[PDB]
Amino acid sequence: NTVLSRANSLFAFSLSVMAALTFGCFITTAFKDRSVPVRLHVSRIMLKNVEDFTGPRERSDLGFITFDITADLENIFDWNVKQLFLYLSAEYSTKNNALNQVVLWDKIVLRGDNPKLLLKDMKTKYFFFDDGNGLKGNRNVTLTLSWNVVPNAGILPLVTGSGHVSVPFPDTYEITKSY
Amino acid sequence: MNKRQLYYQVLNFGMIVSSALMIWKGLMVITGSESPIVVVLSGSMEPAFHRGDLLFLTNRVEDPIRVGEIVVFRIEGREIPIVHRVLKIHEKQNGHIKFLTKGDNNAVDDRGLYKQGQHWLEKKDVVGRARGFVPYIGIVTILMNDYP
Amino acid sequence: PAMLEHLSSLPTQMDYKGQKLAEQMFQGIILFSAIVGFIYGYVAEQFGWTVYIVMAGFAFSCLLTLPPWPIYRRHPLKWLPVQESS
Amino acid sequence: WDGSAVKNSLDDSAKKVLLEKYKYVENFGLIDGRLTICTISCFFAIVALIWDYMHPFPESKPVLALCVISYFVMMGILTIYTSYKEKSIFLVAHRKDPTGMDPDDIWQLSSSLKRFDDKYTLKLTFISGRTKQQREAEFTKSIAKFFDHSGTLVMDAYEPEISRLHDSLAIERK
Numbered sequence: 254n255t256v257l258s259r260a261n262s263l264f265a266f267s268l269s270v271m272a273a274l275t276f277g278c279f280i281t282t283a284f285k286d287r288s289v290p291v292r293l294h295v296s297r298i299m300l301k302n303v304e305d306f307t308g309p310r311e312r313s314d315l316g317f318i319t320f321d322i323t324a325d326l327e328n329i330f331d332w333n334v335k336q337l338f339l340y341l342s343a344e345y346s347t348k349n350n351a352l353n354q355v356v357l358w359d360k361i362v363l364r365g366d367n368p369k370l371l372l373k374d375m376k377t378k379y380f381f382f383d384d385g386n387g388l389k390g391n392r393n394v395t396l397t398l399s400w401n402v403v404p405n406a407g408i409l410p411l412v413t414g415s416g417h418v419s420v421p422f423p424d425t426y427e428i429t430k431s432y
Numbered sequence: 433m434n435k436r437q438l439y440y441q442v443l444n445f446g447m448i449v450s451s452a453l454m455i456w457k458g459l460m461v462i463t464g465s466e467s468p469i470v471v472v473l474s475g476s477m478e479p480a481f482h483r484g485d486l487l488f489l490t491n492r493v494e495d496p497i498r499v500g501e502i503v504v505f506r507i508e509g510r511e512i513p514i515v516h517r518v519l520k521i522h523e524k525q526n527g528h529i530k531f532l533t534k535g536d537n538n539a540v541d542d543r544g545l546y547k548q549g550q551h552w553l554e555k556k557d558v559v560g561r562a563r564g565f566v567p568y569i570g571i572v573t574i575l576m577n578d579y580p
Numbered sequence: 581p582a583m584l585e586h587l588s589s590l591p592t593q594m595d596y597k598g599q600k601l602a603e604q605m606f607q608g609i610i611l612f613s614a615i616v617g618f619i620y621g622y623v624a625e626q627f628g629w630t631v632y633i634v635m636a637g638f639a640f641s642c643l644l645t646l647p648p649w650p651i652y653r654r655h656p657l658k659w660l661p662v663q664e665s666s
Numbered sequence: 667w668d669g670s671a672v673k674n675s676l677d678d679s680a681k682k683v684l685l686e687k688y689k690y691v692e693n694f695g696l697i698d699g700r701l702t703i704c705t706i707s708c709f710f711a712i713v714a715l716i717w718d719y720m721h722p723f724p725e726s727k728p729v730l731a732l733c734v735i736s737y738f739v740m741m742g743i744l745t746i747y748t749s750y751k752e753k754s755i756f757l758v759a760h761r762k763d764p765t766g767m768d769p770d771d772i773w774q775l776s777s778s779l780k781r782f783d784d785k786y787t788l789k790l791t792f793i794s795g796r797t798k799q800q801r802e803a804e805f806t807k808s809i810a811k812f813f814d815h816s817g818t819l820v821m822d823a824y825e826p827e828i829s830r831l832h833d834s835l836a837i838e839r840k
């Protein structure tokens with residue numbers, strides 16, 4: 254009847270406030286182009302029981318990784334960040350030109366749970382799987398901590414923090430005695 | 433004959449449906465591969481990525497694949513686009529890429545693709561990499577798709 | 581004749597410049613709520629205050645939009661020149 | 667509620683009193699140009715849609731990109747074509763029996779009413795081929811004074827403007 258004027262007005266103001274919130278949200282995610290890294294410090298390393306697991310599926314190699322972490326996150330919190338995520342870049346090379354990498358662990362970190370992230374001798378339940386059992390004879394493995402976050406409505410960058418640990422490896426020894 | 437009503441009908445109808453379908457095709461072209469803009473429906477990703485989100489999609493324009501990234505691919509048993517996370521990489525510099533994959537909040541791999549002896553993701557069994565997400569329109573479009 | 585004056589007989593029998601200044605006030609209070617929203621989001625440093633200010637501004641726009649303005653309906657010719665009777 | 671109702675109703679009444687009193691043959695052709703551009707756009711749109719339905723994508727990327735860039739620049743030239751030729755001029759009519767005379771002295775007419783303002787404008791011009799010169803008559807008025815919500819948009823209240831039109835046509839055509 255006569256509510257068509259109110260209908261046109263509600264379409265106009267609804268598209269107006271929708272346009273206003275969209276302009277606000279990409280001006281919000283526009284100016285934060287710069288990112289900041291994190292720091293990694295590992296005291297010692299422990300490496301044990303690297304064994305040749307002769308299995309029915311493949312004849313692969315199995316090993317365990319145990320280390321310590323000390324870090325800080327008091328300069329990484331942002332205004333539109335929601336979730337903090339971990340993944341471990343453990344890159345090495347084999348004899349068949351295969352650049353391998355195995356991740357270790359992750360945490361569902363919310364803003365306000367833990368002000369200082371430092372803990373010793375953790376054990377990762379994820380199986381460190383070797384592809385074509387060429388780790389027996391490697392001379393270096395390296396580790397570098399990286400992370401990933403999600404914004405409110407923006408893009409997904411990955412920022413790898415600076416810091417790497419390089420650990421050698423013996424020739425042929427099954428139950429590795431490390432200090 | 434029918435001049436004016438057929439005139440304005442073909443005008444507004446063809447304008448709306450042609451413009452919508454070919455800006456969709458323009459997004460298909462500009463994303464490199466096919467790569468439609470998709471919506472999330474996973475349940476095992478909810479502490480990491482909530483329900484009802486739009487996702488854009490970038491592709492292989494002069495960049496190789498890395499680790500620590502969402503990867504969307506085909507499920508051929510149901511023919512459904514499903515996204516997970518990458519966990520393992522295994523490459524050789526001659527043109528074949530075979531690696532493992534495993535989602536978040538699970539101790540279970542992405543089963544259904546291959547057997548236990550073979551790697552899960554081949555380089556041709558992939559859709560791409562999503563850069564961006566919209567957290568509000570996805571609930572609206574899945575409630576529109578769930579309406580008959 | 582009289583066979584075509586049925587459905588096309590409703591133009592706006594109201595003011596013009598009064599609704600001009602009214603829509604100026606609507607866009608003004610919307611931009612004012614928006615600017616205090618993002619400066620209070622910049623000060624208080626979380627997004628839920630900006631959400632609450634935007635939703636409160638939308639609710640205030642609805643509460644200033646829905647009312648009839650009966651005085652304006654009673655006197656469209658208060659500012660417009662007075663129309664004649666057929 | 668919007669002005670477009672009284673705009674197109676007054677345009678229909680103007681065309682009705684034109685055909686009822688002045689007896690001239692209305693024509694078009696810019697509408698036929700709109701037919702041309704919309705049918706050609708739908709032609710290559712449906713051809714590209716069927717060609718993408720029958721063939722896979724990465725062997726169909728580049729010429730489809732060329733087609734969508736061609737459609738974008740075609741819509742751009744269509745937009746500037748509309749903004750440069752079809753502002754408000756809405757009708758063209760030609761005369762009867764040009765026995766030995768050149769087809770000139772042809773009039774265009776337009777109705778101007780801006781966004782939510784009480785200032786109606788009727789601008790009609792004609793090309794007269796005696797000196798190849800245009801003459802334009804303008805009306806800056808308002809119509810909504812006398813009648814009421816019942817909608818008395820009758821000829822019996824608007825006839826002096828048409829009287830001015832036909833005796834101006836008489837004193838200009840001698």
Ligand SMILES: *[C@@H]1O[C@H](CO)[C@@H](O[C@@H]2O[C@H](CO)[C@@H](O[C@@H]3O[C@H](CO[C@H]4O[C@H](CO)[C@@H](O)[C@H](O)[C@@H]4O)[C@@H](O)[C@H](O[C@H]4O[C@H](CO)[C@@H](O)[C@H](O)[C@@H]4O)[C@@H]3O)[C@H](O)[C@H]2NC(C)=O)[C@H](O)[C@H]1NC(C)=O
Nearest residue numbers: 344345346352391392393394395396413417418419420421
């Ligand atoms: C540990 O084992 C490695 C290999 O087994 C030996 O080789 C060096 O490793 C370091 C890193 O541990 C390398 O430094 C980085 O190299 C990157 C490219 O090199 C890659 O490819 C070679 C191919 O042989 C691999 O050997 C190597 O491990 C890498 O996988 C660069 O891209 C890096 O640059 C980064 O930092 C700079 C700032 O400095 C940024 O500007 C860049 O954008 C980028 O982020 C980095 O330079 C090094 O190049 C390797 N070679 C040599 C000769 O040193 C290590 O020697 C061994 N260590 C020990 C103690 O045994």
